[PDB]
Scaffold this active site. Structure first.
Site, short mmCIF file in Angstrom:
data_model
loop_
_atom_site.label_atom_id
_atom_site.label_comp_id
_atom_site.label_asym_id
_atom_site.label_seq_id
_atom_site.Cartn_x
_atom_site.Cartn_y
_atom_site.Cartn_z
CD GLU A 122 -3.24 0.55 2.02
OE1 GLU A 122 -3.17 -0.46 2.28
OE2 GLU A 122 -4.26 1.58 1.99
NE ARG A 123 -2.37 4.96 0.00
CZ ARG A 123 -3.55 5.66 -1.31
NH1 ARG A 123 -3.08 6.09 -2.48
NH2 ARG A 123 -4.72 5.56 -0.52
CD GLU A 129 -7.30 6.43 6.46
OE1 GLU A 129 -6.72 5.48 6.05
OE2 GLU A 129 -7.44 7.47 5.91
CE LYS A 147 -0.91 8.69 9.86
NZ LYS A 147 -1.25 8.28 7.55
CG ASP A 158 -2.69 11.26 4.66
OD1 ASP A 158 -2.13 10.19 5.64
OD2 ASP A 158 -3.02 11.01 3.64
CD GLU A 194 2.73 6.63 11.17
OE1 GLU A 194 1.74 6.02 12.06
OE2 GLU A 194 2.23 5.94 9.66
CD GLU A 227 -0.06 7.93 0.69
OE1 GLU A 227 -0.31 8.04 1.61
OE2 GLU A 227 -1.69 8.14 0.61
#
Ligand SMILES: O[C@@H]1[C@@H](O)[C@H](O[C@@H]2CO[C@@H](O)[C@H](O)[C@H]2O)OC[C@H]1O
Ligand SMILES: O[C@@H]1[C@@H](O)[C@H](O[C@@H]2CO[C@@H](O)[C@H](O)[C@H]2O)OC[C@H]1O
Ligand SMILES: CO[C@H]1[C@H](O)[C@@H](O)[C@H](O)O[C@@H]1C(=O)O
Ligand SMILES: CO[C@H]1[C@H](O)[C@@H](O)[C@H](O)O[C@@H]1C(=O)O
Lengths: 671, 671
Positions: B153-154, B278, B352, B357, B379, B385
């Protein structure tokens, strides 16, 4: 497991019965057997009678007689006027009660049996019938976008009924064939025009036995089977180094492939071909044109009577959005009109109703009327890709009639699209109409119960484009929901109003698109506005629209014959409903309705939601007159529609307020 | 099959050699063996020597000595000052030539061997070394977003190196573990935080033998293994009717699952958890909060020493775009700050760098500094991305230092983010930093050869956030491309300038996004502007920006401590680079640079492309000083970057000309 759709054959009360003792079946071919079986089924279900099937009339029995002209003892003048192979006559004897269903060929008897049953479902008096019916379009076809993994490209009604797990799944196929034949459909392609790796093998010995079994079922209902093909099959499955149509070994490979298919399916219809479109391979890959490419396949099928259906949905799918002189709408005409006269006689060019891609409104493709020496057929999309995906109601029959009744003026006044594709204007040997299927494995077949009307109405228009939308809706509603006058008026109103309601809250004035990329559902005004697909509205802070004029724009209007070209070319005469397809105009431009363009946008988006609310209210008033399961199935979708319509309204209104700075005349809520 | 990245160990000329006869390995643990093997490998490759490995020193041999403090004959004061288990000292004897690498534990000896080899690759004089190094962050982790079908993913660097076909693929894992340990990384989660159906089983007997084999390899390089988990596992694999953390049987199921894992992996690190984000399930599904949810897992792992890494990327992913009072940027603080003091001591909240995001620029997440009683770790996203997907160059180390050096003022001046996550400000027992992996199966590991610098630099910053971007780039370039001064200055310049160049032609002034939906690559100014993800810029014909002020907006500025809240709250003091994150302003607003906002947009988009062209020109000037394969690999991506930068420039400039109506001050080309 699934609904009977419009072939309900609901039991009649005791005051609506018929007396018959025998069905005289003069032939025992598979089509005749199918016709007898359908008659037995409808009469048992509706009338509670079980007449005996016989091969010779009993002159004292009440009877339904089935036969072609050569089976007649006396051939009377009405059936004597039949010329089309699929035509038929239905007449009551005017002498015991006898109904004669007289077909020019066995398929005419089948269509005649479905018509007689339709009269019974509708409650018509059959004591003194005198009917003659002949289809206007020779090809009346369905295209499936089904994949062999069971997915359906742009399918909103469940999974494939043909395929699962890269194989073939038949009782449901038989019932599907009955629905298709009941509305006269006589041709089907079973697999996606985008032919992936497994599907490429449908033309090989590994899958032909299975294809043949499906073709066997459709043949019994007068339906010819076609396959969509991968143009690069000589490479992918035939081990050749190229797919060039002028390469002798490629030509031979296709001839051998044709011979092999006809050993399994002796009446195989032919091939549907998407080539040089959206990254699907084609003749262009080898510097060949589409006459060379189509003719090569046509030559392979010619000894067997097969047809090549060559799709014209060809355009630059790598367009630079900066380039305002390149117009996707001009692409199909510019590619194919110069090839008129170069195609083999068993090639038919299949052209979408409009030049862009099945938008809620598009003007008519200029190719219709422009190629007097090349067979043409029109493609419409029954699956509602840009028309609400069977979440929103959208009965497409009014739109299709606008297209069919559009006068191209190709041979002067009276050159309607329907005369082009029925072959009468130019004497085409093969022509007609095709519709992209809206069905799938959902128990109600079409996702939205009321979208069954779009499949029904497609077949009715393909049989006779002159039928009114009103009478098609009436036929469909009575057969599917019964004859209560409130139910019939309400659902007919819902159907007939639905396309305009959906248009009102989606893209304005013909410009199209404004949809989310990928799945194409729901509002996104700039969704493709800086993309490479040629689908731009050019909205800025002062105005909106594509300039397609000759005077200052892309010159697309010149693809029409002079009467239509002039109408669209002039800002003052261009119809409002297409204005932004043809002109780039300020938001303050006044339409024929008196509205400015920006206030038109607000009006139709606010009012479109109010109309959607009314669709739902009117359905709710039918509670108690519809079985609860279909009542609730439809009500749930109409509620989905109302909520999504609010999203369409507010996204478009906010986008255009943010760009134009012009408020709603009436002060309604714009976020 | 793949590049050695920065562990090239290129052969030295004859004037740069070292004389050693023995390596004294005082222990024979698996980590010591790994350290000896790496030393043997680097010395053979660089120096063409093969010293014998011995367990006791030869007092007349030239030697490298490896040992911990208790192995020392004499413990001198420098290694006597070591306190961190992973710390080490390297010192040359000042008496035969002897180098002592003295670790506090076996992992310190391994990191010390990689440092000594780094000095050799860099050409440093080792005659008189005196070095002490201790990491600042206790957890220095990599998160993999790998799926067991082999997708990532990504992932922009090829397929998973761990999984294929729903199974495990190990020599490449060993070489990966060497790269990670060389830059001090000591923790890894091997599977996607979005845990799908197969991956849920990684905590069961069916896959634990395979997990253990991978953990075995990482352990030898001082790396603890973690798994991401599906919070609903008690339902999905444990046959329980609920996943509620307060249900006694759920609590027991997790305790039994922990005990089972530790039977296979006795030093298992613990779990990474994405919950209630999500559409991934979590405690909220049962009306529980995240302290109850994290603590339940924490209690299962506590008897074994495991950690729960609980991600704070939680927000309303069904936001109404019409609602201007709901602010996604406020969500993580509002969910987690009220829970301070409620978590078990082996829970770490993983946050994060920014509150939205991983955009090209975001302000720092307000949660850092706001929870003195709860362990935190940051993070970052090494996979690019939203920062060019390894098609565009983007060395992320300067951005990460801006975040790490941001003073939160939580305990007054000197409360930098790096002091929060290294545990020193609040005395956290467990804390540190994690990076989302940019690797995959491509032979150059990271897709773009120069993106190897982002993995390298992540590990260097995690070891010591005070290292400069300049010295990290210098270390990376010299080890990977050699010490020609033109090559070193040029690639260092390219790296250090690249993030600002990419920002210049993407979203302006901190507002973020303006990317294509789905894959998130390339320009689409309204891509998510009417979507449900909370990512809006509110551009209209007069101005742009999110009003996050307390005075008139969402009040997000109040989540900062007063000094930062005031800075961002005021239109006049808010830094230009974040202006549109915090204020909605007219296009004519003048920035601190003197530019209006709209002319700033045009300037940076035109000039950003010119800078990208210069990146490519400067690389071309190195032809002949770089091997042809990496020369051409990089040149191809820089050409891709230049062409895509033109698209970013023209799409954004056209969008904003169409909305603002304000031309470019300098008359440059806007389509
Ligand atoms: O006519 C065009 C469509 O065929 C096109 O379909 C898209 C093709 O690329 C895919 O990955 C997308 O999912 C699919 O929607 O959309 C644009 C239209 O112009
Ligand atoms: O943070 C959000 C992302 O997680 C989100 O990712 C999308 C989720 O839905 C999928 O089908 C899309 O492909 C994927 O891109 O994108 C929006 C962002 O706000
Ligand atoms: C089968 O491809 C379809 C495609 O999915 C659809 O988005 C577009 O409308 O029409 C194409 C076509 O007509 O070929
Ligand atoms: C694993 O999901 C990812 C998602 O793909 C990515 O688009 C978003 O940036 O971050 C999410 C996360 O951080 O959980």
């Amino acid at each position: 497991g699934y609904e009977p759709c419009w072939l309900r054959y609901e039991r009649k009360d005791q005051y609506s019965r018929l007396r018959f003792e025998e069905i005289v079946a003069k032939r025992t071919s598979p089509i005749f057997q199918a016709a007898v079986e359908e008659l037995q089924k409808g009469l048992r279900s509706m009338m509670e009678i079980e007449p005996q099937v016989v091969q010779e009339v009993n002159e004292t029995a009440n009877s339904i007689w089935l036969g072609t002209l050569e089976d007649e003892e006396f051939e009377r003048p009405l059936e004597g006027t039949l010329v089309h192979p699929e035509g038929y006559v239905i007449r009551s004897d005017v002498d015991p009660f006898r109904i004669y269903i007289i077909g020019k060929t066995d398929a005419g008897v089948l269509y005649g049996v479905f018509h007689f049953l339709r009269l019974l479902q509708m409650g018509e008096n059959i004591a003194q019938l005198s009917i003659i019916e002949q289809p206007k379009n020779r090809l009346r076809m369905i295209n499936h976008w089904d994949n062999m993994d069971g997915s359906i490209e742009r399918g909103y009604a469940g999974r494939s009924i043909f395929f699962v797990d890269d194989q073939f799944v038949n009782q449901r196929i038989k019932d599907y064939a009955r629905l298709l034949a009941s509305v006269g459909i006589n041709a089907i392609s079973i697999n996606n025009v985008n032919v992936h790796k497994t599907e490429t093998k449908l033309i090989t010995d590994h899958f032909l036995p299975d294809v043949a079994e499906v073709a066997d079922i459709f043949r019994t209902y007068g339906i010819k089977t076609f396959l969509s093909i991968n143009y690069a099959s000589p490479i992918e499955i035939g081990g050749l180094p190229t797919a060039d149509p002028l390469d002798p070994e490629v030509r031979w490979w296709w001839k051998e492939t044709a011979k092999r298919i006809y050993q399994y399916i002796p009446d195989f219809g032919g091939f549907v071909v998407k080539a040089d479109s959206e990254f699907r391979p084609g003749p262009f890959t080898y510097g060949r044109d589409h006459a060379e490419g189509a003719n090569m396949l046509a030559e392979a099928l010619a000894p067997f009577g097969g047809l090549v259906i060559w799709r014209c949905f060809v355009y630059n799918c790598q367009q630079d959005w900066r380039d305002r002189t390149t117009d996707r709408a001009k692409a199909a005409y510019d590619h194919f009109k110069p090839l008129d006269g170069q195609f083999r006689e068993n090639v038919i060019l299949q052209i979408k109703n409009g030049p862009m891609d099945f938008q809620v409104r598009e003007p008519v493709s200029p190719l219709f009327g422009a190629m007097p020496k090349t067979n043409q057929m029109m493609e419409v999309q029954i699956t509602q890709e840009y028309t609400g995906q069977q979440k929103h109601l959208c009965f497409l029959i009014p739109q299709w009639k606008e297209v069919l009744d559009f006068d191209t003026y190709a041979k002067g006044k009276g050159s309607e699209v329907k005369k082009v594709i029925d072959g009468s204007l130019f004497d085409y040997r093969y022509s007609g109409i095709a519709g992209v299927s809206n069905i799938g494995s959902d128990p109600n077949w079409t996702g939205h119960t009321l979208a069954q009307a779009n499949l029904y109405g497609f077949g009715r228009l393909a049989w006779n484009p002159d039928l009114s939308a009103e009478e098609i809706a009436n036929e469909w509603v009575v057969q599917t929901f019964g004859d209560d006058s409130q139910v019939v008026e309400t659902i007919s109103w819902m159907l007939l109003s639905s396309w305009r309601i959906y248009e009102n809250y989606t893209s304005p004035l013909g410009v199209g698109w404004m949809v989310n990329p990928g799945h194409h559902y729901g509002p996104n005004v700039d969704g493709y506005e800086y993309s490479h697909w040629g689908t731009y509205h050019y909205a800025d802070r002062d105005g909106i629209g594509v300039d397609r004029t000759v005077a200052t724009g892309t010159g697309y209007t010149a693809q029409y014959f002079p009467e239509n070209a002039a109408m669209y070319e002039s800002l003052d005469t261009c119809p409002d409903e297409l204005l932004l397809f043809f002109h780039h105009v300020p938001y303050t431009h006044r339409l024929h309705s008196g509205e400015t363009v920006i206030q038109h946008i607000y009006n139709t988006h606010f009012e479109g939601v109010e109309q959607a609310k009314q669709l739902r209210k009117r359905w709710e008033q039918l509670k108690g007159k519809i079985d609860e399961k279909r009542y609730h199935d439809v009500l749930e979708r109409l509620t989905i529609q109302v909520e999504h319509a609010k999203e369409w309204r507010d996204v478009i209104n906010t986008y255009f307020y943010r760009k134009s700075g012009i408020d709603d005349q009436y002060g309604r809520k714009i976020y």
